[PDB]
Amino acid sequence: IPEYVDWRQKGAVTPVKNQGSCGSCWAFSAVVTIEGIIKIRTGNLNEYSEQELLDCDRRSYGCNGGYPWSALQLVAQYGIHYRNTYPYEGVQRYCRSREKGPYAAKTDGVRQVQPYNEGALLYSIANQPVSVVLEAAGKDFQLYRGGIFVGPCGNKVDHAVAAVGYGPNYILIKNSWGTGWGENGYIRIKRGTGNSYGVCGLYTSSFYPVKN
Numbered sequence: 001i002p003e004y005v006d007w008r009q010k011g012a013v014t015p016v017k018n019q020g021s022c023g024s025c026w027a028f029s030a031v032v033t034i035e036g037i038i039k040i041r042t043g044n045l046n047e048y049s050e051q052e053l054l055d056c057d058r059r060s061y062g063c064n065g066g067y068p069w070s071a072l073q074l075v076a077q078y079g080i081h082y083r084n085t086y087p088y089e090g091v092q093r094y095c096r097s098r099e100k101g102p103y104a105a106k107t108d109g110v111r112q113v114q115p116y117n118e119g120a121l122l123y124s125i126a127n128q129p130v131s132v133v134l135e136a137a138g139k140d141f142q143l144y145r146g147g148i149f150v151g152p153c154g155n156k157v158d159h160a161v162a163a164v165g166y167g168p169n170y171i172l173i174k175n176s177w178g179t180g181w182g183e184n185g186y187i188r189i190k191r192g193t194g195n196s197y198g199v200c201g202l203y204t205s206s207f208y209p210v211k212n
């Protein structure tokens with residue numbers, strides 16, 4: 001795999017979003033990976049619906065958190081609408097998939113990256129954007145304004161984000177706290193520090209859609 005991977009350069013990443021005060025990061029994270037894999041496999045870059053996963057993923061808890069795995073599993077089971085057809089409201093509402101017409105995209109499953117393994121994460125990212133979790137509760141992370149982020153931060157993962165690239169000393173993360181945070185909405189987190197958890201537990205739980 002290359003030394004640098006940036007899915008934004010390859011046209012596989014939609015504008016950065018802001019999840020607002022709703023703990024829908026899991027769905028935002030899941031949606032980045034879906035948009036990515038559809039671009040890679042179809043050539044088309046579309047925005048897909050976070051709101052639809054928020055409303056319809058019944059393993060998750062809407063605005064009270066949830067699981068990027070289960071959201072990815074839903075899109076492999078049912079599919080996902082375009083964001084335009086099922087726009088984000090920042091509140092969980094009743095599930096409207098059926099009422100919005102045929103799904104706009106569908107994947108063929110969900111694979112987990114072997115956890116606590118930097119290489120395996122990097123091999124996934126080299127193939128497509130990946131959903132990852134990390135510890136975001138620290139002020140250093142909340143107050144991040146640029147540069148390769150090295151912490152301080154523990155490994156108590158509580159936030160779902162999407163890894164859309166990497167380089168020799170970092171993994172490139174797309175956050176869902178709007179453009180006004182980090183590096184135009186992104187963070188570069190240090191890698192290759194020998195911590196099996198990864199900086200901010202970045203190697204805790206990583207998933208990605210499968211599309212044939």
Ligand SMILES: *[C@@H](C(=O)O)[C@H](O)C(=O)N[C@@H](CC(C)C)C(=O)NCCC(C)C
Nearest residue numbers: 023024025026064065066067133158159
């Ligand atoms: C994340 C956010 O920053 O909006 C949101 O709070 C969330 O879904 N967090 C989850 C992280 C795991 C996927 C690692 C989470 O805590 N999920 C568990 C669901 C309940 C909160 C128990």
